């Protein structure tokens, strides 16, 4: 009912002789290589709408028919999306059939209004000790994850998915906003490997819906894929009544994508370079993540800080919405502590005694003060000597050295390659455990007693095994037989056991090759449209 009038990059003008589609409505370009969905951005006047494409616009002709769907982009939602991968417009890209839709929901939505909000401000127990104690998660809050590579971020993602599905019975959505396809495939196969995504007939027992808008997609597709993950999460909140987890992977890439679609629609950029609507384009996403009266959505958003500058407007606008940070550190991970949460740079708004109580608040502030007190004398130990200062200073060294161990915890999705069984730790057990180490009831137990264990009745069994291990050492000796002729042969024997592989100097490359003949003449279309040589006169 409408036809393409302008194609300028990813930005398509469509003309409607009848009535116009609404802003944010979805339009299908009828007749194309792939499914080309446009989203109406503005009404330009003269019966033209201005749209932003969700796929490539190369191959688009002015006058191509465009069908208005009468609604915004509509995605399949429900339990049938679990363990599937969707793109922004709802198509399955995991190549495992269609998506069993419970409903087909519009991705564009107003935030849950004032009467629906929760005034309670309670804590989301996650089963991770360092996360539950020092930087708790608000049920319905937004949590910034300052991880990276090699700090065990993906294991923490899959464990929040696992522990929230195990404890509270809620499902998870992962919105891969603008992620590389190698990283997205790595996370997919690592979720299949860890059992939070199951393929085939066991597909219903998956805990996670992946919504992937990749980095090679146009800016309109990366700018809207977080809303698709939000819609999948809002179905579980509003219909299933669950405590959902949403993972917006790199909220900065959401910001950068919306900045690109604001630049492409010809809007004047605001401060440093961002979209003029940066606070509202971010708040439109973040205000739909809340606690309703039905359930909640808790959002764990990875935050990239642009030039290591926290006063840049994209992290300064994001940090207004965040309720907790969990900074994952490389220096924590190079002490073998997993999860690699920095126990001192992670913050939470939920850490005050009016929401968690004075018991939990004072235990957390004591633990944080003890680790801080150890932290600002390590330039006094390494300079002047280990046993140089007082015994009370070395008492805080030993207590913080064993609390710094005690924050580590074995993870249930990590047991398929580490062997050590993962241990969910409850909140009251975490409080009662760290209070005991803080007063000094465990000053006699070793420092390796507090390592990769669930709660306080496991550090005792760890030390019990370590002191049964004293009596298991006199069972044998240590020796290495046959100093020069156990299995170490002559080097000619070692080169005469390696097998020669086949190398050929015909490299081939003509295996299933067409070998068309390319014309050197330039071939154009005449006015009838047939392939004709160039008319040889200017």
């Amino acid at each position: 009912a409408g036809y393409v009038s302008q194609v300028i990059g990813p930005v398509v003008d469509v003309r409607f002789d009848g009535e116009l589609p609404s802003i944010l409505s979805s339009l299908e370009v009828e007749g194309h290589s792939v499914r080309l969905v446009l989203e109406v951005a503005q009404h330009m006047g003269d019966n033209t709408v201005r749209c932003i494409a969700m796929d490539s616009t190369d191959g688009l002709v002015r006058g191509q028919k465009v069908v208005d769907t009468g609604s915004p982009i509509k995605v399949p939602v429900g339990r049938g999306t679990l363990g599937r991968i969707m793109n922004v417009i709802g198509e399955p890209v995991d190549e495992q059939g269609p998506i069993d839709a419970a409903d087909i929901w519009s991705i564009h939505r107003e935030a849950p209004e004032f009467t629906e909000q929760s005034t309670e401000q309670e804590i989301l127990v996650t089963g991770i000790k360092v996360v539950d104690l020092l930087a708790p998660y608000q049920r319905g809050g937004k949590i910034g994850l300052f991880g990276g590579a090699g700090v065990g971020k993906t294991v923490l993602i899959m464990e929040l998915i696992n522990n929230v599905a195990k404890a509270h019975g809620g499902f998870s959505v992962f919105a891969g906003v603008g992620e590389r396809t190698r990283e997205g495939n790595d996370l997919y196969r690592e979720m299949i490997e860890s059992g939070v995504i199951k393929l085939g007939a066991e597909r219903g027992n998956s805990k996670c819906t992946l919504v992937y808008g990749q980095m090679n997609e146009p800016p309109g597709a990366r700018a809207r894929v977080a809303l698709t993950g939000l819609t999948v999460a809002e179905y579980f909140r509003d219909i299933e009544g669950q405590d959902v987890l949403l993972f917006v992977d790199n909220i900065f890439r959401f910001t950068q994508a919306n900045s690109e679609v604001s630049a492409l629609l010809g809007r004047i950029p605001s401060a440093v370079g961002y979209q003029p609507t940066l606070a509202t384009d971010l708040g439109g996403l973040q205000e739909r993540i809340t606690t309703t009266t039905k359930g909640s959505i808790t959002s764990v958003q990875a935050v990239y800080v642009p030039a290591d500058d926290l006063t840049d407007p994209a992290p300064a606008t994001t940090f207004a919405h965040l309720d907790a940070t969990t900074v994952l550190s490389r220096s924590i991970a190079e002490l073998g502590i997993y999860p690699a949460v920095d126990p001192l740079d992670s913050t939470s708004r939920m850490l005050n005694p009016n929401v968690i109580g004075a018991e939990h608040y004072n235990v957390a502030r004591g633990v944080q003060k003890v680790l801080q007190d150890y932290k600002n004398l390590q330039d006094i130990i390494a300079i002047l000597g280990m046993d140089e200062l007082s015994e009370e200073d070395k008492l805080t060294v030993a207590r913080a050295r064993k609390i710094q161990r005690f924050l580590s915890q074995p993870f249930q999705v990590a047991e398929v390659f580490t062997g050590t069984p993962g241990k969910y730790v409850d909140l009251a057990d975490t409080i009662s455990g760290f209070q005991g180490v803080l007063t000094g009831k465990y000053d006699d137990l070793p420092e390796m007693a507090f390592y990769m264990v669930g709660d306080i009745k496991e550090v005792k069994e760890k030390a019990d095994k370590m002191a049964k291990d004293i009596a298991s050492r006199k069972e044998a000796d240590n020796k290495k037989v046959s100093e020069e002729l156990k299995d170490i042969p002559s080097l000619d024997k070692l080169v005469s056991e390696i097998k020669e592989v086949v190398i050929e100097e015909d490299d081939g490359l003509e295996e299933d090759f067409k070998a068309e003949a390319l014309s050197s003449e330039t071939v154009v279309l005449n006015e009838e449209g047939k392939s004709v040589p160039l008319p040889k006169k200017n």
């Binding site: 950029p269 401060a271 440093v272 370079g273 030039a307 500058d309 840049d312 300079i383």
Partner: protein, 50 residues
Amino acid sequence: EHASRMSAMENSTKSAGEMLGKLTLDYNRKRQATITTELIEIIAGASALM
């Protein structure tokens, strides 16, 4: 003397870290203002043609 110098260059790195942090914050302000002012120049140049 050596221990007094060890305590004197302890405060010097403290001072050269707090001065560095102030200077890094002010550099971040100048970086943001540079990008904004060059962008406003480019937009004003383009809008005077279209």
